[PDB]
Design a protein around this nucleic acid. Sequence first.
RNA 1: AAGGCGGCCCCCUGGACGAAGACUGACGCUCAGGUGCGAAAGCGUGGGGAGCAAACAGGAUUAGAUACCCUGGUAGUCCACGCCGUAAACGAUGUCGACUUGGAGGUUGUGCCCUUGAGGCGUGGCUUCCGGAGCUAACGCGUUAAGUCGACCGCCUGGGGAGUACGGCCGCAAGGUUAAAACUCAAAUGAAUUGACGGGGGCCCGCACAAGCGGUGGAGCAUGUGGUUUAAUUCGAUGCAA
RNA 2: CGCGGGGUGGAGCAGCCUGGUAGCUCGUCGGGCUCAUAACCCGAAGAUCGUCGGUUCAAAUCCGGCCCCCGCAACCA
Lengths: 56, 117, 76, 151, 91
Amino acid sequence: PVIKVRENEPFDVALRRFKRSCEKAGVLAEVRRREFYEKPTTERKRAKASAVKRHA
Amino acid sequence: RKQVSDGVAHIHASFNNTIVTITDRQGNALGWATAGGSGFRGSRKSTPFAAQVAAERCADAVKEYGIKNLEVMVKGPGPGRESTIRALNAAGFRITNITDVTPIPHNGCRPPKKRRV
Amino acid sequence: KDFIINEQIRAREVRLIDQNGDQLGIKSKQEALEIAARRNLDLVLVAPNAKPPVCRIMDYGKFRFEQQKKEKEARK
Amino acid sequence: PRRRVIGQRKILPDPKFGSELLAKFVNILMVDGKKSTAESIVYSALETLAQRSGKSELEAFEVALENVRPTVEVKSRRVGGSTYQVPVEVRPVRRNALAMRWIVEAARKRGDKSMALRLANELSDAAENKGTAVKKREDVHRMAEANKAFA
Amino acid sequence: VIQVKEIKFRPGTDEGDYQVKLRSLIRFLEEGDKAKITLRFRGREMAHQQIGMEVLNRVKDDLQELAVVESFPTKIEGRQMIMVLAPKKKQ
RNA sequence: AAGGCGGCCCCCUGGACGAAGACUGACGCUCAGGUGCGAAAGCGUGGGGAGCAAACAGGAUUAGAUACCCUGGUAGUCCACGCCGUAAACGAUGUCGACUUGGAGGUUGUGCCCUUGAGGCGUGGCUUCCGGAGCUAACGCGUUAAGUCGACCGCCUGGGGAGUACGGCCGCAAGGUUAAAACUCAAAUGAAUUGACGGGGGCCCGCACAAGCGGUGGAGCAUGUGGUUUAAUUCGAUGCAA
RNA sequence: CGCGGGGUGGAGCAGCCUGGUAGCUCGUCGGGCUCAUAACCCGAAGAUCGUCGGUUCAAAUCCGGCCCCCGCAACCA
């Protein structure tokens, strides 16, 4: 998520863009995911569970 | 003592703390301030407000060179990712570019165990 | 052990001793700070209660590391 | 107010000037249902304020109220074991009520001889934006701007 | 200086459990603290004739090497009895 | 096949599936014993060693804290060649074959259609979620069966004792495999039900909080209680609900 | 005349060869947490650093005496 402010665009709008670029890019989610070791069995467990919830 | 007018704000925002460093394009350190060393400890150290005064204190130990434009390099997930950037812009700074540079391994090193608190 | 250094010093004037033991005399805190800076060293308040307070020009980090090293080694 | 939302009783206007606003004021100053004696004190204070301070009785009232009116405030809140302080932007109707209420309260907490003289001098002070009541607005803002981060 | 730290020896703290934390209590003393034993009887102002002074006395007698005790107190205050233990004093 | 297998490229190699037709001619299914494979940890020799981390040390927490948290950190985790042969090694469901209504998807072949659109109509392999009869103690399973049948194998016979002891075989070791009895109890167990409870959770109400106005807690007096006193201070009411 | 290690606050320590207001534990007295107590938490009290001479800018830490405790050493029949 690289951003370049355009002319006569307020610092705020550019910022809001930037934060949404990272929301889009999944940075913090990604960093959260890797802060700590997850066992393979555990991430397979996570994967099934979300497949399941993704039925409405 | 010297002149730059064109810089880059590298902000390291970890969960426990947020270090702000101002630099030229070359990557040479012009000035720095941290939250933990601006009168904030533990529970207060890890706040966006502490990161803000860090950005403020840093803009005072750099305007000796009279920077006038800069880019921002946001690293890490903590507070002061964003609030630090704000303080810079209000301190009298034109923001050219914003970039997240938080490192992402392509799954390399095994991280520490989960904390069972 | 811990000494206050550089801008933490509040004394208006101090007696200055450089890194080699040269007695520089009584200096304003401002001038003492300038001398330390040109030598890329720290201004350390080694005798807070002396009259006037005594400051020594030295590398505080290197000094502190060596002191802690000494203490640790002699106890293990 | 868990389930039942409501409207609000729309009190009669001030008998003398026909102002709903001053009716909100006499009531706020009123004590022990002494309406008769409440409006007596409000007027004599307005009369004292009006006569010897450039007249425009309703307007004089507003100049003073304009000054103690608060734009934002904080609402206490308890999340994850923590009592956070959330600054809320407050609505116009209540804005008047707080403004009126702090003017009345600062008046009784005053040294002067009667409530009418006290009320009058509170309005005057507020009109010049000084005194206790204005200071009550400022603490509200100092307290608000502080927790600006959590809005 | 000499600090006060503490250990406890409850009833049902015998050899097993006990001398493990006689090891802990060495540690306290051997930091150079005055290690205060607190008994905590299932009991009273005279709980025991057993609970306390087996334990306490054998804590002294085992630790006697490194530590000695200030007093063998045997005056309980409440439902609990402090035996006070110190570094063994150089004469 | 199971264990398990994930950056990209090449080389060597196993299996599966489809289309068409030719060939062999029941050459098939199952399998005690036997043989081979078989996560992780562990073992032996020699390499390797960033990160992680049993052990261990130090800092904290705590009544204690040989833990949970923090700062370090050895074996190990990695490679080669050997060993070990165990897991909730699980679908807790042996293998093979035949038969029995349906709906929505995923994946992967293949025949057909102005390919005239990212499609239209068929036909195989695997797979996910529902569900019909039937089955089932129920939960649930339901053409990938736990339905309807047949062929062969493995295994069970109340709980604890015990996957223990003894013997045999196996292993450098740790240990594995086969596998009892005395003794003791009237239970142990499965699924589902109504409560209660959760540091349990969700949704929702009440002047419960929030928003307000006035109080009690201070003072003097009235009054009740406790306590104390007394010959007696009569008996009862005692958390919200005295 | 005969070895060891120590002397700091009520008790036990740290501050040591690295000489500039002596800090860290248990107790002491308060405060906080609880319906209450234990436990725990915030805190304050508490000193010629054994005692002297040397030695020094200032020596807790610097040397040596006086002296004391413990250590084993010993009363080793």
